[PDB]
Design a protein around this ligand. Structure first.
Ligand SMILES: Nc1ncnc2c1ncn2[C@@H]1O[C@H](COP(=O)(O)OC(=O)CCCC[C@@H]2SC[C@@H]3NC(=O)N[C@@H]32)[C@@H](O)[C@H]1O
Ligand SMILES: Nc1ncnc2c1ncn2[C@@H]1O[C@H](COP(=O)(O)OC(=O)CCCC[C@@H]2SC[C@@H]3NC(=O)N[C@@H]32)[C@@H](O)[C@H]1O
Ligand SMILES: [Mg+2]
Lengths: 235, 235
């Protein structure tokens, strides 16, 4: 009854009033590619590492099941599909979102969405959390806060699924295309701090052909950061 | 992201752009009580006694998994929950839906919806097919044809699910209650022909305390029809 016209992503959609985590459900259950897992709220929303993702009602919390027949080298770009897709849907709603490497979407520097990719077996789970009408943690923002009025969640859902379906289909044919869209939509030419041990600081110059953030330290040294137990903070 | 507020029916919803039959999928798959299976269109939709059910895009084709904790004697009343639920939704949209024993809902004697209940052990699948905006076979009707305008499919879904949840919750507590609702909404006091092992004609006067259709033949003889391998036709 949703009448989705997408080719792959959205062929099936499993909705929950409540759930622990759409990402967890997605990787522990057998699902055909393109299946979307979505819930009104998550009791155990997951961020990177052991971080929690606040998932109260009013937001868009979903996971998509993928099984891309592309070289292993390209898989790390899946997170960018989610991020660019969010940016595209925000634009449709007249909101300018900017990507903060490697998985965040910011609006005027406030986090409005986060992307979490997990790969179990030949299956890949693309998780996306977008604040729409829900209240958010201090420092974050939502579509409702940016526009001044509630946005129909289903309208956002349809827009995002349509955008992701297109990005994904192109990704399967032209896997390097997404990087271009990312460069044109991410925060660069600014100073950042790379936490963790070996912690350093420098200017985020660009992302390379593998999706690595290229940083120029004050000494002129160039480091290439791969995203994992990695965290980027502005300063 | 649908934001359903029902207690049981609709705790989860599995949507398909296309499927063979929601009733088949619901009977076959391991699903929790309250889970709703809905598809834009069915390729192998069916009615009773191996009959085909046209399921083109525009209609509401869904199945609900239930595990009614009531005496085995009350299970046959489940089909009425479906029919009454549809009638209420139709009335909310100002369409005069009336129940035709045993599983149909008509508008001016033209079928607009059919209910098919299929029986496992502790699991019951409540299937409902309601013509909304889809083309229908000659002699049938749709909400769109009745209203002279297209109706938002999602609004009909929300209405029906809300009604069914309330009706189901009450059924668990008072299994006899639905019979009153069936009586106030069923086509009665008219001449009907019952088809089973042979056939006979008479006035459909009412349903009894077991949901059996009471027929009064011209001889004054009273027969009690149990819905099974039988068919009812108006003269
Ligand atoms: N609702 C919210 N809005 C903005 N920021 C939030 C937020 N909830 C938590 N945060 C902050 O963002 C950080 C997490 O950032 P990270 O970069 O590590 O992680 C993320 O940004 C990924 C979030 C992925 C969420 C989706 S929801 C659908 C699916 N199911 C799941 O269980 N997860 C995925 C937290 O440590 C918080 O400080
Ligand atoms: N779309 C339609 N609208 C009105 N009448 C139809 C119709 N499609 C078929 N019919 C007629 O209705 C008869 C079927 O009547 P019955 O009383 O036996 O059976 C029914 O009326 C039950 C139909 C149940 C349909 C739902 S759709 C969701 C779920 N998944 C399924 O596969 N089935 C259920 C057929 O033999 C046709 O003559
Ligand atoms: Mg019938």
């Amino acid at each position: 009854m949703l009448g989705l016209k997408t080719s792959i992503i959205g062929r099936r959609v499993i909705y929950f009033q409540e759930i622990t985590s759409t990402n967890e459900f997605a990787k522990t259950s057998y699902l055909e590619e393109g299946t979307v897992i979505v819930a009104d709220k998550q009791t155990m929303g997951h961020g990177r590492l052991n971080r929690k993702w606040e998932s109260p009602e009013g937001g868009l919390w979903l996971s998509i099941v993928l099984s891309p027949k592309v070289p292993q080298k390209d898989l790390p770009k899946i997170v960018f599909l989610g991020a660019v897709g969010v940016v595209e849907t925000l634009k449709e709603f007249s909101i300018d979102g900017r990507i903060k490497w490697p998985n965040d979407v910011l609006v005027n520097y406030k986090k409005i969405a986060g992307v979490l990719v997990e790969g179990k077996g030949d299956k890949i789970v693309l998780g996306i959390g977008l604040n729409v009408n829900n209240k958010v943690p201090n420092g974050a923002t939502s579509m409702k806060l940016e526009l001044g009025s509630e946005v129909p969640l289903l309208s956002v859902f349809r827009s995002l699924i349509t955008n992701l379906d297109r990005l994904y289909l192109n990704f399967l044919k032209n896997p390097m295309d997404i990087l271009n869209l990312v460069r044109d939509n991410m925060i660069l030419g600014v100073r950042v701090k790379i936490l963790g041990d070996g912690s350093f600081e420098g200017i985020a110059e660009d992302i390379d052909d593998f999706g690595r953030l290229i940083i120029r330290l004050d000494s002129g040294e160039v480091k290439k950061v791969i995203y994992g137990d990695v965290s980027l903070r502005f300063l």
